[model samples]
Target: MLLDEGWLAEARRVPSPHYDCRPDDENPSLLVVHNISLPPGEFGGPWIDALFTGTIDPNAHPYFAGIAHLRVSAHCLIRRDGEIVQYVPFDKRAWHAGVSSYQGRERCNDFSIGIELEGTDTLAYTDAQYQQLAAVTNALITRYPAIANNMTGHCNIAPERKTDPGPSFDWARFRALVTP
Candidate 1:
């Protein structure tokens, strides 16, 4: 994976409207990992894309009605098959982290990059997802020095409000692969 002006060259660009410019065009300083599956646990559908792009059809599913109104997006997503989809540019502020904090800093979205893995909290991620994530992370680290090796799960930054990239995600294995 590689970046070209904040957009990943190898990813399928899926421009979303749920993002905006970062404050002062600041480069992201943190990487927040997350997991998502349309209808909570189901995968391999267009719903995830619909949700991120603000086109989710509430009538398509019961779950869609509740979340279709939310304007949320992530910088990138690594699918179960290792396909990468980019919704927002790295230099922009994606609305993935809502009312969150990191360390002493507040509003993590202001200085963070968000990557969503196509999965649920309890399910084990595939090897393809991990490999693609590692490659994406490497490219991100190279492009944004501010992030500089800092990585965390969404649950870590928003414990009271979220739990994702959860217990099923193997941190040790992922770290080893991402590390030099």
Candidate 2:
């Protein structure tokens, strides 16, 4: 749940979807980046937090009624400003991906760490986000030796059902950040 390098404390922690308290997380071996916007594609709003934490006001938008209080969360969320937030721990099931699979592995939510970006499939990501993503990814590689080249996106895991961290997501840049 730590944030920032030490100076610009512009970082924040992701709120929990659960109304109750939870314990710390451990043994995280997978990292999954998924994209989300409050209204499916809109940008720059606190609605992302509200939606993930089950605090979204259903009346805010007609679409809100379908998702409000839906009980979902991610281990971390990297905002458009590069701010990082921790909602669920790395080891806990964050309920980010549902009915997902990868290489014969079913139910990815049980074994992967989810990190959501504050953008959609069509919009390009920011330099700040890419930088922070590298920092976080490298730290994860070192922290969890179990995670290897298989470091993948939601789309790769569930090709038929999910498409996130999509085309606009820079795969080449991300690969450059990882140690060979």
Candidate 3:
């Protein structure tokens, strides 16, 4: 899949209103791996789109009432079936990283591109998800050369607050698939 003006040509576009322009130095140096499934463990729904686009209704789910007020989005989301959904443009600062840091840098959203996997922390991710994410990662690295060495996980970036793309994500397997 190729990018067209920060948008992925092959992804299903679901433009989000929760993102903003990146800093003056627009090179995205980091790629943050995250995982999400609306209503906690549930999968395959419009809730993820709704949440990212700032359209989630608090009354829709018991859990949404607590988080629907917040704004958040990711550059892309690779589903279990390997379907990719693009929310924010790659050139923008998506809200996926909240009060986070990468290495020594704070507020990682300013310099990182977030890609959320549709999954839970402990559940094994689908084979399709892995293959798709590897492809997406390769495309992202091409667009942002600085990302070659800065790929990391959301759990590592925000240790105290989150743990996703967690143990289920096999780094060795994924690294092998991502072409250098």
Model 3 Cα shift for residue 31 (angstroms): 0.4
Ranking of models by lDDT: 3, 1, 2
TM-score of candidate 3 against the unseen true structure: 0.97
What's the true lDDT of residue 172 in model 2?
Answer: 88
Candidate 1 residues 37-89, lDDT tens each? Answer: 98788889998889999999999989889997798989998899999999998
RMSD of each: 1.0, 3.9, 1.0
Per-residue lDDT of model 3, residues 15-57, tens digit only: 8888898989578889999999998999998999999999998
The TM-score values for the models, in the order shown, are 0.96, 0.84, 0.97
Model 1 weakest lDDT span, ten residues long: 141-150
Among the numbered candidates, top lDDT falls to: 3
Clashing residue pairs in candidate 1 are none
Q: Which ten residues in a row have the lowest lDDT in candidate 2?
A: 1-10
